[PDB]
């Protein structure tokens, strides 16, 4: 995401002070995180006996239970990967590049079929099927998830803004740009201590509005304008913002500047979800995790029993 780190106020928070909170988890961010940090001794991804990567399933299961043991009730938010994904103020132009000049012509030679295999992989190790498998696992676990209309980080931010959850869990700071009141990092990966970022604190301390923060983000470069503007960093961008000339500069330097802004200010969201937890299907989890994905039986058994009691007691 946007490298705000060194430039915005934030504070380390203990797992204890996070007890009893509801959180919306940025699903894809979490999955990618598990894939890069949950690996073998040699840095190789976790895999079952068929050679399929199980890194994500491991984090989904154990990380989610770890959170519930500390009275942190999570709701998983996914992007809803399938084709259509228009972020309801997001149809005018792109979402990929299928619109114009995306290189369209006649050609389908040896390299074309060698390229046949040369696509799906683009979807990194985190494949749609793996993502679908993670959702299935959550259902078996009785853990609720939402398939956002488009960007999951936007859906999670909206849920937090509404007060349905206390914060958005993610390793990225981008949720702040969608108005998320709070973001908590380092829960999906615990190398460092949990870190809380309160949007109100960021704005008051830096003396800027959310709209100003988004401008700084645009200067630095968002997923919507990679590379940002002329190598300008946070300091220089913040300088232009405080001077009151940032907006004029961005209109000149960034095509579709207004469109990008609308993505953060007017994302497509949904109210169709539930934070309710359900009892876990112990048998189905064992079959999926142990039988089909070679997880250690003993460990899984112990955890599904603990998960059941947590939800039973929570509920
Ligand atoms: Mn992002
Ligand atoms: Mn995302």
| CA of residue 224 to ligand 1 center, whole Å | 9
User: Rounded CA gap, 54 and 51, in Å?
Assistant: 9
**Count of C-beta atoms within a 10 Å radius of residue 141:** 29
The reply, when asked if residue 153 is annotated as ligand binding, is yes
Q: What are phi and psi of 26, to 5 degrees?
A: -70, 95
The reply, when asked if residue 223 is annotated as ligand binding, is yes
The reply, when asked if residue 147 is annotated as ligand binding, is no
| CA of residue 78 to ligand 2 center, whole Å | 8
Structure tokens at 119: 């696509």
User: Rounded CA gap, 284 and 286, in Å?
Assistant: 5
Cβ pair 44, 111 in contact under 8 A: no
Q: Which residue has the tokens 């989890």?
A: 285
Cβ pair 156, 25 in contact under 8 A: yes
31: alpha, beta or left? (left if phi > 0; alpha if psi -120 to 50): alpha
User: Rounded CA gap, 100 and 103, in Å?
Assistant: 8
User: Rounded CA gap, 65 and 306, in Å?
Assistant: 8
User: Rounded CA gap, 178 and 224, in Å?
Assistant: 14
- 182-185, strands of its sheet edge to edge: 11-12, 195-198, 182-185, 167-169, 22-26, 73-78, 145-147
Structure tokens at 177: 């740009």
| CA of residue 171 to ligand 1 center, whole Å | 10
User: Rounded CA gap, 115 and 3, in Å?
Assistant: 34
DSSP for the chain, written as a single string? ----GGGS--EE--SGGGTT-EEEEEHHHHHHHHHHHSB-TTSPBPB-TTS-B-HHHHHHHHHHHHHHTTT-EEEEEE---SS----SS--SS-SSS-SS-S------SHHHHHTTSTTGGGG-SS-HHHHHHHHHHHHHHT--EEE-SS-HHHHHHHHHHTTSSSEEE-SSSGGGGGT-SEEEESSSS-SS--EEEEHHHHHHHHT--HHHHHHHHHHH--TTSTTTTTT--HHHHHHHHHHT-HHHHHHHHSTTHHHHHHHHHS---------------HHHHHIIIIITT---HHHHHHHHHHHHHHHHHH-
Q: Which residues of 179-203 are buried (b: 16+ CB within 10 A; e: fewer)?
A: bbbbbbbbbbbeeeebbbbbbebbb
Technique of determination: X-ray
Which of 139, 95, 134, 146 minimizes the C-alpha distance to 269?
Answer: 146
User: Rounded CA gap, 41 and 183, in Å?
Assistant: 31
| CA of residue 287 to ligand 2 center, whole Å | 30
**Count of C-beta atoms within a 10 Å radius of residue 22:** 17
Structure tokens at 19: 């007890």
Which of 124, 157, 151, 131 minimizes the C-alpha distance to 223?
Answer: 151
Resolution (A): 2.0
Residues 6+ apart with CB under 8 A from 41: none
Cβ pair 4, 237 in contact under 8 A: no
Q: What is the set of domains in the chain, with CATH numbers?
A: 1-207 (3.40.50.1010), 208-267 (1.10.150.20)
- Beta-sheet pairing, 182-185 with 195-198: antiparallel
**Count of C-beta atoms within a 10 Å radius of residue 126:** 18
Which of 53, 52, 74 minimizes the C-alpha distance to 62?
Answer: 74
Bridge partners of residue 12, in order along the sequence:
195
Name the CA radius of gyration of the chain, rounded. Answer: 21
The reply, when asked if residue 174 is annotated as ligand binding, is yes
**Count of C-beta atoms within a 10 Å radius of residue 93:** 11
Q: Which ligand is nearest to the CA of 80?
A: 2
| CA of residue 43 to ligand 1 center, whole Å | 25
User: Rounded CA gap, 122 and 78, in Å?
Assistant: 19
**Count of C-beta atoms within a 10 Å radius of residue 145:** 19
Q: Which residue has the tokens 């931010």?
A: 157
| CA of residue 249 to ligand 2 center, whole Å | 27
32: alpha, beta or left? (left if phi > 0; alpha if psi -120 to 50): alpha
The reply, when asked if residue 26 is annotated as ligand binding, is yes
Cβ pair 188, 36 in contact under 8 A: no
Cβ pair 253, 227 in contact under 8 A: no
Cβ pair 49, 296 in contact under 8 A: no
Structure tokens at 223: 């997923």
Which of 72, 140, 76, 78 minimizes the C-alpha distance to 274?
Answer: 76
Which of 171, 193, 5 minimizes the C-alpha distance to 183?
Answer: 171
Q: Which residue has the tokens 């990008």?
A: 260
| CA of residue 68 to ligand 2 center, whole Å | 23
The reply, when asked if residue 258 is annotated as ligand binding, is no
């Amino acid at each position: 995401g946007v490298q705000f780190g060194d430039f915005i106020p934030k504070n380390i928070i203990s797992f204890e002070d996070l007890k009893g909170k509801k959180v919306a988890i940025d699903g894809m961010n979490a999955l990618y995180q598990f894939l890069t940090s949950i690996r073998l001794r040699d840095g190789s991804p976790l895999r079952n006996r068929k050679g399929e990567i199980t890194s994500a399933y491991n984090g989904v299961f154990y990380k989610t239970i770890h959170l519930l043991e500390n009275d942190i009730t999570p709701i998983w938010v996914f992007d809803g990967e399938p084709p259509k994904l228009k972020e309801k103020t997001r149809k005018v132009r792109r979402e990929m590049k299928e619109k114009a000049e995306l290189k369209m012509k006649e050609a389908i030679k040896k390299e074309d079929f060698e390229e046949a295999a040369k696509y799906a992989k683009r979807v990194s190790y985190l494949t749609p099927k793996m993502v679908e498998n993670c959702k299935y696992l959550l259902s078996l676990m009785g853990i609720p998830y939402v398939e956002a209309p488009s960007e999951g980080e936007a859906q999670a931010s909206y849920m937090a803004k509404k007060g349905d959850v206390w914060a958005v869990v993610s390793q990225d700071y981008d949720a702040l740009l969608y108005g998320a009141p709070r973001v908590v990092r380092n829960l999906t990966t615990t190398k460092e201590m949990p870190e809380l970022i309160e949007l109100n604190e960021v704005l008051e301390d830096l003396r800027i509005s959310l709209d100003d923060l988004i401008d700084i983000a645009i200067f630095m470069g968002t997923d919507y304008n990679p590379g940002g503007v002329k190598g300008i960093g946070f300091k220089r961008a913040y300088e232009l913002v405080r001077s009151g000339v940032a907006k004029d500069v961005l209109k000149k330097e960034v095509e579709y500047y207004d469109e990008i802004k609308r993505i953060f200010k007017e994302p497509k969201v949904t109210d169709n979800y539930s934070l309710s937890l359900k009892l876990p299907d112990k048998e189905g989890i064992i079959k999926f995790l142990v039988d089909e994905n070679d997880f250690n039986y003993d460990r899984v058994k112990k955890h599904v029993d603990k998960l059941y009691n947590l939800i039973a007691n929570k509920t």
